[PDB]
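Lab meeting, action items carried over

1. Structure of the four-component assembly. Owner: GW. Status: complete.
Input record:
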Amino acid sequence: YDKNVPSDYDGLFQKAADANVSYDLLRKVAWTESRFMQFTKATAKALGLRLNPELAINAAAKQLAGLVGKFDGDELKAALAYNQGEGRLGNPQLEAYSKGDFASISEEGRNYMRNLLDVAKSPMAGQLETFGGITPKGKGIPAEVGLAGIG
Amino acid sequence: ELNGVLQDPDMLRRPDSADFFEKYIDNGLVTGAIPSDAQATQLISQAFSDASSRAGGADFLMRVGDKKVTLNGATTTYRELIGEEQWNALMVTAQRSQFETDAKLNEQYRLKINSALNQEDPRTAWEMLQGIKAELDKVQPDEQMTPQREWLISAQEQVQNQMNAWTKAQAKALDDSMKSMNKLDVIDKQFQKRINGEWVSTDFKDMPVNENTGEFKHSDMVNYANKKLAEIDSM
Amino acid sequence: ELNGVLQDPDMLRRPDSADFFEKYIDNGLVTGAIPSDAQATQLISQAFSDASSRAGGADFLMRVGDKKVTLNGATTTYRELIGEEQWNALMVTAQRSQFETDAKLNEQYRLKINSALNQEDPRTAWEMLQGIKAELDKVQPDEQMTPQREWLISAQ
Amino acid sequence: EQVQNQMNAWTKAQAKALDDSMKSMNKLDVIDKQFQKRINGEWVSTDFKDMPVNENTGEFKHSDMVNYANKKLAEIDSM
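Predicted assembly:
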């Protein structure tokens, strides 16, 4: 449903935003929320500090910098902390993610990670990529590769 | 004597009970406790049917089907005493027996499945279904086609059929809100052709209509009228 | 000793394992390793049930059912030791066993089928269905009526 | 697992009943806002056929002003 071949203003901007994380991730984090950073929460705009690509991608690049820096080796943990903040809701999940207890993270954090690990790199990548296979040797199908053509 | 460490449904799934069974059969065949190879076979085929029809048995069986035993002079692996086909049947039975020996597991999984087919968002049913497929791999660790792995298959291929309708109901909701934007765009174009010096009416009953707009109601001008004034105020 | 080159589910579909089985049975009957023709028959009927209930077995069977073997003085082809009807049942089983021995194949094919019945354009579901009928011919190479060839028929 | 399937429909029929009674409150709120923009000295019509419409309100009927008219008088009487 997505590719890295088509280039637009997005790829034109994240080339420097990643220099001020990863261009491959920052191109993908924005795509999933706003097709081609969509900080929809009013508090996320008051805390992150709108609809201008000069700072929106610059806001995501700053958060994803610290989120991918708070552990420096867990980029899937970073993408999770992005759409699941560390206050009163993400703390029970993020402490349950490192222990490999993906059955107790969220219905939205898993669906988010499962869509972005194809371009992101984590040590728990191959452990979530097979989190829910039909057989323990199987691979659980994420939401938008089993629901691909339905539309 | 096998019901000492092969009945406690938590003492099967341990990884030593496989070694206990291998050592039992071996030291019984060697030290005369099990005299006849026509009798160690009955002990195998009765301990496997005790451990298959019992919660915790699928992984004990999958662990023991790789240990070596020597019967009738020919040495082999327990997956090969019993045939390949018969071992497949055995593991299927050992996985699906812990769902009709206790009805709490059957109740629980069926209710999670069904309350996962009734979530409003079809994309948020799929992670529930991966959750179920993750709590099945803790009770059935072999890749055979147990009937619970048929619940999950029908659930997934039911959620796809649900999304085929939910997407139709979302496209019919972006059809009635792109109409109500087409109408404001055409009304603006009419006002602009009238302002720049061209003689075309601007009553709502005289706009053009092309199946992207529909018939113009009165409230599709009020909406426009309060939206040019709103935009002109913001300049 | 047959589980050395007839169990690895990629070593069955090779085109030499048929020759390995033919040479095993022949040189066992000739060089006394397999003494009795009432025992080479049991080796046949157990190696075929090992190779039929195992991923990769349908094409090994379809390859071996044309090799020559001599039992009870009468020389024949393995499709004719076992009857015609029994060979049909055997190949049906050997094709449909690799879809209930692993549930990954069953899951995958059923989901592609169902996500092919839910495409909006009915003309673009048909090429998806020819795709499925093209990835079934890689696991079931004989023309019997396996239940997966019933999925595809109901899908069309 | 049949009662769950029944509640999936009963909840849909309760959300369609809080959709037609939140519309009929949106309309009174927007009519009040129109009267208040007209009172505080601004030139916007207050006929029911000239309110704004945004799919949270629908088209305004006449009886959605009668209802409002008997409800300001009812509120002003209670002060």
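2. GW to write a short summary for the group page. Key points so far: The CA atoms of residues 31 and 51 of chain D lie 7 Å apart. The radius of gyration of chain D is 17 Å.
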